[PDB]
Amino acid sequence: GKASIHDLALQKWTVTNEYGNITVPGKFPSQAHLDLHAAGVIGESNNGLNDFDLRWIAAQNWTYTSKPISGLSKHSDIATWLVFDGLDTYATVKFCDHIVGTPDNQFRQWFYDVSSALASCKSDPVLSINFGSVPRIINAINASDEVQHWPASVVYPFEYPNRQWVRKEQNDFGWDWGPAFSPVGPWQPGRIVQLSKGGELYSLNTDIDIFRKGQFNNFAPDQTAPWVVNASLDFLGTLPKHASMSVIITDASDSRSVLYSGKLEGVTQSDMTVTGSVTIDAHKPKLWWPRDMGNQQLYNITVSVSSAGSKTPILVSQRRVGFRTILFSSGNITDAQIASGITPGNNWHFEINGHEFYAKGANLIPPDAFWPRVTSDRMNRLFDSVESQNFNMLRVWSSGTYLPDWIYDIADERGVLLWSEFQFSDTLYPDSDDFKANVVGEITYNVRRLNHHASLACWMGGNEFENLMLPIAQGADPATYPYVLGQYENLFITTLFNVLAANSHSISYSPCSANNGWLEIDLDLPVPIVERYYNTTSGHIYGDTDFYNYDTSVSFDTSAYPVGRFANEFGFISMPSIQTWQQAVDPEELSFNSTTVILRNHHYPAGGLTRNIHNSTLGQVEMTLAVERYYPTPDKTDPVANFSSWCHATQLFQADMYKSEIQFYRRGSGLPERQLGSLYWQLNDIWQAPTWAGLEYDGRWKVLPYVSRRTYEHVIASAFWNYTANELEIWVTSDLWEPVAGEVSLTWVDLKGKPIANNAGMTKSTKFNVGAINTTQIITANIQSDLKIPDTSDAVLVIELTAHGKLPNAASSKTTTFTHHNHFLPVWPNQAKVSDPKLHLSYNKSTKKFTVEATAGVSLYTWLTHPAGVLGFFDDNAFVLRPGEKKEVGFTLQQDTTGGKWTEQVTVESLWDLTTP
Numbered sequence: 001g002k003a004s005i006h007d008l009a010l011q012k013w014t015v016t017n018e019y020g021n022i023t024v025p026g027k028f029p030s031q032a033h034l035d036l037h038a039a040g041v042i043g044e045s046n047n048g049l050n051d052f053d054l055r056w057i058a059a060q061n062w063t064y065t066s067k068p069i070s071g072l073s074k075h076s077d078i079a080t081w082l083v084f085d086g087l088d089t090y091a092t093v094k095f096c097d098h099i100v101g102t103p104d105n106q107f108r109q110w111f112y113d114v115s116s117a118l119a120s121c122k123s124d125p126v127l128s129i130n131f132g133s134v135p136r137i138i139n140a141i142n143a144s145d146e147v148q149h150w151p152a153s154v155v156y157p158f159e160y161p162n163r164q165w166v167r168k169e170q171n172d173f174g175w176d177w178g179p180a181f182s183p184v185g186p187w188q189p190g191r192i193v194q195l196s197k198g199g200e201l202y203s204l205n206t207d208i209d210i211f212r213k214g215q216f217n218n219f220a221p222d223q224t225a226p227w228v229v230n231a232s233l234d235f236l237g238t239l240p241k242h243a244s245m246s247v248i249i250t251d252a253s254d255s256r257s258v259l260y261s262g263k264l265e266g267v268t269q270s271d272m273t274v275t276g277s278v279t280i281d282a283h284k285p286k287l288w289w290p291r292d293m294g295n296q297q298l299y300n301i302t303v304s305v306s307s308a309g310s311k312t313p314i315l316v317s318q319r320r321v322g323f324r325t326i327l328f329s330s331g332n333i334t335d336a337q338i339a340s341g342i343t344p345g346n347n348w349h350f351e352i353n354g355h356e357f358y359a360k361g362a363n364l365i366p367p368d369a370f371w372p373r374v375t376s377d378r379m380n381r382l383f384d385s386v387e388s389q390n391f392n393m394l395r396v397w398s399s400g401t402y403l404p405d406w407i408y409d410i411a412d413e414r415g416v417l418l419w420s421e422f423q424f425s426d427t428l429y430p431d432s433d434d435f436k437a438n439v440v441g442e443i444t445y446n447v448r449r450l451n452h453h454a455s456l457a458c459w460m461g462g463n464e465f466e467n468l469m470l471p472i473a474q475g476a477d478p479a480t481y482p483y484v485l486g487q488y489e490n491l492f493i494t495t496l497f498n499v500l501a502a503n504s505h506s507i508s509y510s511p512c513s514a515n516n517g518w519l520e521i522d523l524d525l526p527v528p529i530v531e532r533y534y535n536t537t538s539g540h541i542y543g544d545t546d547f548y549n550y551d552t553s554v555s556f557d558t559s560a561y562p563v564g565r566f567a568n569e570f571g572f573i574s575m576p577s578i579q580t581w582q583q584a585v586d587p588e589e590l591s592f593n594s595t596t597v598i599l600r601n602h603h604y605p606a607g608g609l610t611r612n613i614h615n616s617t618l619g620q621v622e623m624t625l626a627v628e629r630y631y632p633t634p635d636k637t638d639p640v641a642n643f644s645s646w647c648h649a650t651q652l653f654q655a656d657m658y659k660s661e662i663q664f665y666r667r668g669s670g671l672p673e674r675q676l677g678s679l680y681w682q683l684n685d686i687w688q689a690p691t692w693a694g695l696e697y698d699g700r701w702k703v704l705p706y707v708s709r710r711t712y713e714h715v716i717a718s719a720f721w722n723y724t725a726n727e728l729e730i731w732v733t734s735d736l737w738e739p740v741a742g743e744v745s746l747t748w749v750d751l752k753g754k755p756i757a758n759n760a761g762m763t764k765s766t767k768f769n770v771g772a773i774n775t776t777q778i779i780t781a782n783i784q785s786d787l788k789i790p791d792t793s794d795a796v797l798v799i800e801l802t803a804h805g806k807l808p809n810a811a812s813s814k815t816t817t818f819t820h821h822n823h824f825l826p827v828w829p830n831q832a833k834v835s836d837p838k839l840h841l842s843y844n845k846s847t848k849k850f851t852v853e854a855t856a857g858v859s860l861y862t863w864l865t866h867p868a869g870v871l872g873f874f875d876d877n878a879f880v881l882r883p884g885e886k887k888e889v890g891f892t893l894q895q896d897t898t899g900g901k902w903t904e905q906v907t908v909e910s911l912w913d914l915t916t917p
């Protein structure tokens with residue numbers, strides 16, 4: 001009595017428009033834009049001015065129609081189910097010309113019993129799904145006087161308005177880094193399931209919750225307590241009474257190694273769910289740790305459900321899990337912490353297996369406007385870049401969508417923690433019973449689906465509420481504010497925290513991405529999480545920092561930087577490379593201020609459907625002023641080269657700025673705020689455009705990820721310049737869990753490479769001692785009073801740190817050697833009297849290393865550019881080169897279309913090359 005499964009991917013599909021004039025072959029999973037493009041009806045969607053040009057697609061319905069489905073049993077003894085892991089978004093599901101469902105959530109798994117429609121069918125059944133025009137449907141919802149309305153500033157759009165009414169990826173209606181395609185279709189896998197009476201069941205969703213005995217969300221668990229493995233299985237259809245549950249927990253690496261094999265206790269069952277648990281000895285399982293914190297130990301758990309009077313199990317579910325505790329700490333700073341020197345207020349940090357760690361990473365946004373075309377290769381390449389940059393965490397930004405299982409699998413294997421969020425962003429949402437019920441379905445499904453993942457670090461209700469949107473609402477409408485605040489608590493706390501707490505004991509919660517923490521957490525309270533909000537005391541520090549300041553005059557002034565617990569967002573836009581631009585924009589539009597380049601810059605957004613040149617120009621100006629203030633301004637005779645050099649110059653500013661911020665946040669770990677995290681805005685691009693991204697759409701590295709890789713190293717030497725006071729401070733910051741000792745080399749040379757007399761009055765070398773997740777000031781000097789630099793515009797301090805220590809949880813007796821390369825320029829980069837360094841580049845086919853040598857003098861911001869046709873990244877880039885120093889640079893080759901020829905096409909340049917004709 002096995003379950004008969006037909007994958008909908010293996011069925012023949014046809015896509016039709018609303019007006020019956022367009023008919024193209026379809027795919028499953030897919031979206032209309034992709035099927036239209038594959039057929040040649042439209043060009044690539046990311047190209048030119050297609051954000052405007054392709055609006056006729058989103059403005060209409062698209063229907064996915066299968067050819068008649070063969071192989072289904074017509075025996076009335078058999079329940080036939082349509083199972084959809086994702087439909088985007090408003091759809092009408094027809095089976096044999098009968099409407100059986102009307103889904104309205106992208107983030108929910110939909111299942112419909114089609115047994116009667118099948119029985120009624122005169123011939124083989126046709127499955128059709130008619131996807132509505134989301135902007136039309138939302139406009140119609142808003143048009144009703146009977147629904148809720150908010151002030152203009154609260155529901156202000158990026159491109160399409162009324163997005164708060166739909167349970168669809170919010171950036172699909174446009175964002176300030178992306179287009180507004182509003183795609184529709186079967187965005188995730190789908191199946192037809194035929195179940196026989198008294199036979200095998202079908203697994204819909206499985207929730208595995210591995211926690212320490214007595215563990216509760218947002219509270220530090222007991223690390224000496226035994227492990228509890230709770231298995232809750234959602235299914236179709238009929239499970240008989242007195243159900244039995246057994247598990248086999250084997251090592252994910254070796255099947256032969258069995259952790260636990262036995263029955264589950266405290267079995268509970270309902271119409272479509274069966275739950276049980278097992279307690280395992282605290283000493284037995286090997287712990288999972290994030291990357292560079294130990295091993296990423298995983299286990300394969302297979303849960304078998306048997307019925308009384310059945311030899312074989314009727315339901316079997318498998319998941320890959322990890323034994324670990326992850327705490328998001330947002331409660332009050334304890335008396336013990338105050339006594340240790342920590343400023344009072346509230347926490348904002350993470351703890352892995354009871355250990356505090358410094359979080360390093362960025363914000364992950366969707367890599368494509370069309371989720372179906374995002375492949376395993378594309379995500380694995382992105383993850384290579386994440387690891388190479390020395391990340392331990394990504395913030396999975398809302399909204400955004402809930403990532404599929406396969407993406408979390410990558411993070412589980414690699415050891416990258418994923419700070420996760422519910423799909424609510426930069427606006428206020430309705431709180432009607434129907435909307436809330438739809439949200440509950442989405443939260444229940446995704447929390448249950450994702451709980452087993454070792455990489456899941458936390459759940460946050462939404463993006464930018466208490467720090468932005470709620471204060472906007474209080475200003476925009478003081479009278480309606482308490483009501484609106486009440487809805488926020490009702491949806492994001494009362495409902496959402498309860499749905500999470502019911503389905504997870506292991507994952508911590510925060511009602512939004514940025515807040516001042518909580519006063520109380522108690523499920524007995526009408527509002528379970530009592531938020532601190534603006535109940536603050538002067539001098540006290542609360543929450544994470546979400547900081548952007550576009551005034552370029554203070555970009556490198558640390559007194560302008562926020563003093564907080566954690567930095568979850570920070571950034572400035574930069575142009576992508578010319579190679580990236582060439583993929584989407586016409587050659588004649590390859591100029592800094594071309595109409596197509598401007599219109600693709602969504603900083604600042606249109607605030608509607610207009611071609612807003614004014615708002616977009618604001619971002620273009622910000623980039624221009626940033627270059628003009630600090631970097632050599634290109635003036636190349638070749639317009640192509642001029643555009644490329646200006647693009648590069650914007651990247652230099654972005655990189656250096658983030659570095660200035662990262663080193664400041666990291667140094668805070670040893671200061672009274674006890675800063676424990678840096679997540680820059682943003683990691684990746686959704687398309688070819690000027691954004692806050694470090695990784696371009698195809699994966700190409702900007703200057704930013706090379707500078708952030710170094711700045712995210714375990715032990716770093718950071719130069720802090722108070723330019724108004726003319727004071728230089730060099731600090732050593734370590735994120736290791738043990739103290740380390742080491743030395744920092746300090747070499748003052750002129751721009752020709754010749755040493756400055758008496759090393760400009762500064763010591764040539766200094767020893768250091770830095771504590772666990774702490775900082776130490778190694779140098780303090782006034783550039784005028786304490787130092788003797790003959791010409792500040794003909795001087796550079798080269799910083800080289802060496803330290804010896806151990807990474808957390810290293811078995812090895814052998815100590816790791818930590819090295820960090822940095823520099824200090826006593827003037828802005830545009831003031832440095834650089835001369836042609838006369839760079840020589842060569843590639844060695846055996847060692848797979850590029851040799852870079854500066855021949856005539858000092859080279860600043862030495863830059864290697866890989867051509868198009870190759871994917872990957874260099875082992876270092878944007879570095880200082882002293883003459884005669886032969887630098888070896890390797891390349892992580894991810895993909896090559898050149899047959900090895902790409903190495904001949906690699907170019908080298910420096911700060912000097914910006915100002916040549």
Ligand SMILES: *[C@@H]1O[C@H](CO)[C@@H](O[C@@H]2O[C@H](CO)[C@@H](O[C@@H]3O[C@H](CO[C@H]4O[C@H](CO[C@H]5O[C@H](CO)[C@@H](O)[C@H](O)[C@@H]5O[C@H]5O[C@H](CO)[C@@H](O)[C@H](O)[C@@H]5O)[C@@H](O)[C@H](O[C@H]5O[C@H](CO)[C@@H](O)[C@H](O)[C@@H]5O[C@H]5O[C@H](CO)[C@@H](O)[C@H](O)[C@@H]5O)[C@@H]4O)[C@@H](O)[C@H](O[C@@H]4O[C@H](CO)[C@@H](O)[C@H](O)[C@@H]4O[C@H]4O[C@H](CO)[C@@H](O)[C@H](O)[C@@H]4O[C@H]4O[C@H](CO)[C@@H](O)[C@H](O)[C@@H]4O)[C@@H]3O)[C@H](O)[C@H]2NC(C)=O)[C@H](O)[C@H]1NC(C)=O
Pocket residue numbers: 207209230231232234268269270272273275277440441442444445448498499501502503504505523524525526527
């Ligand atoms: C393992 O794991 C698991 C999980 O997984 C777990 O379990 C869990 O538990 C928890 C705790 O308890 C819970 O929670 C709860 O809930 C409730 C509701 O319930 C209902 O529902 C649910 C859900 O459903 C869904 O889902 C599922 C899954 O999937 C399925 O199955 C179904 O079918 C459904 O589905 C659907 O829907 C969805 C959405 O939602 C979607 O998605 C889908 O698709 C579809 O459509 C369920 O589950 C339940 O079921 C249940 O129950 C029944 C009877 O009723 C049975 O039959 C079954 O079996 C179950 O049972 C279970 O549970 C219970 C409890 O409930 C117990 O007893 C038993 O034994 C068993 O176990 C149902 O149906 C809600 O309501 C609640 O509430 C709350 O509570 C809290 C605490 O707890 C608090 O805080 C809050 O507040 C609330 O309360 C309130 O209210 C009440 C009334 O209503 C009262 O009484 C109280 O007092 C309060 O009030 C008060 O206060 C306030 C303030 O605060 C004021 O205002 C007033 O005035 C007054 O004064 C809760 O949340 C859950 O449920 C569970 N789950 C399960 C699945 O099971 C376990 O535990 C673990 N284990 C270990 C060892 O750890």
Ligand SMILES: *[C@@H]1O[C@H](CO)[C@@H](O[C@@H]2O[C@H](CO)[C@@H](O[C@H]3O[C@H](CO[C@H]4O[C@H](CO[C@H]5O[C@H](CO)[C@@H](O)[C@H](O)[C@@H]5O[C@H]5O[C@H](CO)[C@@H](O)[C@H](O)[C@@H]5O)[C@@H](O)[C@H](O)[C@@H]4O)[C@@H](O)[C@H](O[C@H]4O[C@H](CO)[C@@H](O)[C@H](O)[C@@H]4O[C@H]4O[C@H](CO)[C@@H](O)[C@H](O)[C@@H]4O)[C@@H]3O)[C@H](O)[C@H]2NC(C)=O)[C@H](O)[C@H]1NC(C)=O
Pocket residue numbers: 018061090091092097098099100101102104130131132133137140141165434435
């Ligand atoms: C483009 O695509 C869209 C989306 O796929 C198409 O619209 C969809 O059309 C289908 C078929 O017409 C609708 O299916 C249902 O239709 C009626 C209900 O009609 C009533 O409700 C709808 C929806 O109202 C909601 O949306 C509008 C915005 O458009 C909004 O103004 C309104 O306030 C409502 O919004 C609330 O609710 C939704 C959730 O539904 C939330 O998302 C919102 O947030 C908000 O809370 C109105 O448009 C109508 O004017 C009318 O008021 C219903 O009777 C149908 O019932 C059949 O199907 C169910 C199974 O689903 C079954 O149980 C029933 O027994 C019944 O089945 C029998 O009848 C059918 C024939 O009808 C037969 O084949 C069967 O064999 C059975 O004998 C059905 O549920 C769907 O609601 C609608 N979706 C939306 C979002 O509008 C649109 O047609 C298409 N256009 C073109 C040109 O192709």
Ligand SMILES: *[C@@H]1O[C@H](CO)[C@@H](O[C@@H]2O[C@H](CO)[C@@H](O[C@H]3O[C@H](CO)[C@@H](O)[C@H](O)[C@@H]3O)[C@H](O)[C@H]2NC(C)=O)[C@H](O)[C@H]1NC(C)=O
Pocket residue numbers: 592593617620621624628646
């Ligand atoms: C691309 O787009 C802009 C086209 O209008 C252009 O912006 C202009 O940039 C100049 C500087 O190059 C600004 O000039 C002033 O900028 C500040 C602002 O107060 C002053 O401190 C300066 O001394 C200078 O007077 C203009 O204000 C600015 N125009 C606007 C409308 O803001 C960009 O320069 C163009 N970019 C490139 C690379 O060509």
Ligand SMILES: *[C@@H]1O[C@H](CO)[C@@H](O[C@@H]2O[C@H](CO)[C@@H](O)[C@H](O)[C@H]2NC(C)=O)[C@H](O)[C@H]1NC(C)=O
Pocket residue numbers: 592624633634635636637638639642643646
């Ligand atoms: C390279 O690009 C820069 C920046 O766009 C060009 O500089 C502009 O030149 C025009 C000449 O009419 C001036 O009116 C603008 O004020 C200049 N803008 C800036 C930001 O300096 C430069 O002309 C280009 N070089 C070429 C093609 O020779």
Ligand SMILES: *[C@@H]1O[C@H](CO)[C@@H](O)[C@H](O)[C@H]1NC(C)=O
Pocket residue numbers: 019021022
């Ligand atoms: C399809 O028909 C509509 C009118 O029913 C028209 O506006 C649209 O341009 C037509 N499209 C094509 C590709 O023929």
Ligand SMILES: *[C@@H]1O[C@H](CO)[C@@H](O)[C@H](O)[C@H]1NC(C)=O
Pocket residue numbers: 139142143144145149161162
């Ligand atoms: C939403 O509805 C109100 C009232 O019907 C209307 O004034 C407003 O223009 C609508 N908003 C949009 C963006 O369509």
Ligand SMILES: *[C@@H]1O[C@H](CO)[C@@H](O)[C@H](O)[C@H]1NC(C)=O
Pocket residue numbers: 251252253254255300318319320
């Ligand atoms: C463990 O399960 C994963 C899927 O979650 C699978 O890819 C892997 O092959 C399994 N390994 C073993 C040893 O069972």
Ligand SMILES: *[C@@H]1O[C@H](CO)[C@@H](O)[C@H](O)[C@H]1NC(C)=O
Pocket residue numbers: 604605606607612615
């Ligand atoms: C964007 O454009 C709208 C419409 O012209 C305008 O009201 C808004 O202020 C602009 N945004 C910014 C940041 O200037």
Ligand SMILES: *[C@@H]1O[C@H](CO)[C@@H](O)[C@H](O)[C@H]1NC(C)=O
Pocket residue numbers: 340341669670674771772773774775
């Ligand atoms: C950092 O190190 C200093 C000594 O340099 C020490 O007094 C302080 O308590 C340390 N802070 C932490 C959080 O370890």
Ligand code: NA
Pocket residue numbers: 344539
């Ligand atoms: Na105080």
Ligand code: NA
Pocket residue numbers: 464
């Ligand atoms: Na944001």
